[PDB]
């Protein structure tokens, strides 16, 4: 089995700048048979280049494929706000066909620091035998941000889960959704409920917190 | 121009075999491979198999060389992708490609890159229940830009479409995606920001629409 890997995994550039993104083959691509593809979110890939090098009708002169044997390589000239998406390279020389692990590329912005809010469980959830604590960070980039759970001044791990959206069309912010989840026993046996988020904007973390029935 | 339409969506249970299948609009269909490439929520690409119609010469990738089975149908321009033995990690979208061109007909020198793809069809694994989302009030902090909004728990299978006063508001909405919970259930948190000094004269309603399920409520979010 031939493997390819990709490099870098997340693309960081601005609007205008040149993207070069690289694959790099387990072995020798037979014939020179590597392709690129570009997929949104929510949509099916589009060939973009075939044959390492050669470009389909209909495709943006600002893409162009070169390299060959173990290293090839994508390249948009200029990036503009339409391509910043996700890029695959699929070796198709033989029998057995292989993808790689694609490369996002993304916006680049002044990093913001995140909105913090938390929201107790629902009164109508609490009467229906379970309890979400849900902890929102609204715009920020970029997207590493940390998100801990503290009950009673105590780490909680194991529960709550995250989420994060995709990158804005408008302004190139992400926004991360976290959702404790515990049963209403578990839930009425404490009060103080804080959750604490530390990103890049942030110079020390913020804990945003309430008490349970105030 | 070719065009591949797929079937529709559908949930399995943990066992059974599914068949989705792949019509090809346009152009021929006898002399180019068509594969199938599915794809997990949030992974990337990964290659199945595929099989040139007019040969019957089936090619599968070795993590499904037990359990997959491709086929063509010439009379129908039809592809069929059957997956035995179905279990939750093969939950994902597959896609029905074909290699594009460079002519038309039974010429035109192949290209060998998926040029051509279908929709996509979600295919569930679960051995959970279609369930309609329960819709919870997220409250604005009685304590501008104050963040309000929907928590849609528990419901099965994806997908789910939130909007805000029936489509009204859009600015400062984000819908974030859905997360797999241990009981099997999916589900996910619609907010948006508004001015604080508009929490008590507008009227902010989430509607949930929930497809598989036939399920939509729209929730009345008020501060407490
Ligand atoms: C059209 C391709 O259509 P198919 O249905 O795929 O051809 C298969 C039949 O055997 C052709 O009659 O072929 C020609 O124009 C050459």
């Known amino acids: 089995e031939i493997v390819l890997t990709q490099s870098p995994g997340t693309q960081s550039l601005s609007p205008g700048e040149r993207a070069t993104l690289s694959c790099r083959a387990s072995?020798?691509?037979?014939?020179?048979?590597l392709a690129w593809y570009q997929q949104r979110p929510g949509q099916a890939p589009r060939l973009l280049i075939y044959?390492?090098?050669s470009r389909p009708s209909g495709v943006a002169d600002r893409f162009s494929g070169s390299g060959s044997g173990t290293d090839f390589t994508l390249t948009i000239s200029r990036l503009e706000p339409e391509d910043f998406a996700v890029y695959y390279c699929?070796?198709?020389?033989?029998?057995?066909?292989?993808f790689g692990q694609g490369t996002k590329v993304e916006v680049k912005r002044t990093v913001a620091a995140p909105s913090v809010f938390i929201f107790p469980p629902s009164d109508e959830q609490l009467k229906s035998g379970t309890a979400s604590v849900v902890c929102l960070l609204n715009n920020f980039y970029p997207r590493e941000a940390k998100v801990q759970w503290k009950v009673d001044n105590a780490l909680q791990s194991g529960n709550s889960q995250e989420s994060v959206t995709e990158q804005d069309s408008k302004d190139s912010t992400y926004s991360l959704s976290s959702t404790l989840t515990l049963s209403k026993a578990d839930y009425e046996k404490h009060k103080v409920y804080a959750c604490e988020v530390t990103h890049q904007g942030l110079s020390s973390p913020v804990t945003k917190s309430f008490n349970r029935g105030e | 121009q070719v065009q591949l339409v797929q079937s529709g969506a559908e949930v399995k249970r943990p066992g059974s075999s599914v068949t989705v299948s792949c019509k090809a609009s346009?152009?021929?269909?006898?002399?180019?491979?068509l594969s199938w490439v599915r794809q997990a929520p949030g992974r990337g690409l990964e290659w199945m198999g595929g099989?040139?119609?007019?040969?019957?010469?089936?090619n599968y990738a070795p993590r499904f060389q037990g359990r997959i089975t491709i086929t063509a149908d010439r009379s129908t321009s039809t592809a069929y992708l059957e997956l035995n033995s179905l279990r939750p990690e093969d939950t994902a979208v597959y896609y029905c490609?074909?290699?594009?061109?460079?002519?038309?007909?039974?010429?035109?020198?192949?290209?060998?890159?998926?040029?051509?793809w279908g929709q996509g069809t979600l295919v569930t694994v679960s051995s959970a229940s279609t369930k309609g989302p329960s819709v919870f009030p997220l409250a604005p902090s009685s304590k501008g830009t104050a963040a309000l909004g929907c928590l849609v728990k528990d419901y099965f299978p994806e997908p789910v479409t939130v909007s805000w006063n029936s489509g009204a508001l859009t600015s400062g909405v984000h819908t974030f995606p859905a997360v797999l919970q241990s009981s099997g259930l999916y589900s996910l948190s619609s907010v948006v920001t508004v001015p604080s000094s508009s929490l008590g004269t507008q009227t902010y309603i989430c509607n949930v629409n929930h497809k598989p399920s036939n399920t939509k409520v729209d929730k009345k979010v008020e501060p407490k």
């Open positions: 346009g152009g021929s269909f006898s002399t180019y491979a």
């Open positions: 099989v040139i119609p007019l040969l019957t010469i089936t």
């Open positions: 044959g390492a090098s």
């Open positions: 699929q070796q198709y020389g033989q029998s057995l066909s292989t």
């Open positions: 072995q020798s691509v037979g014939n020179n048979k």
């Open positions: 490609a074909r290699e594009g061109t460079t002519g038309w007909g039974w010429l035109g020198k192949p290209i060998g890159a998926f040029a051509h």
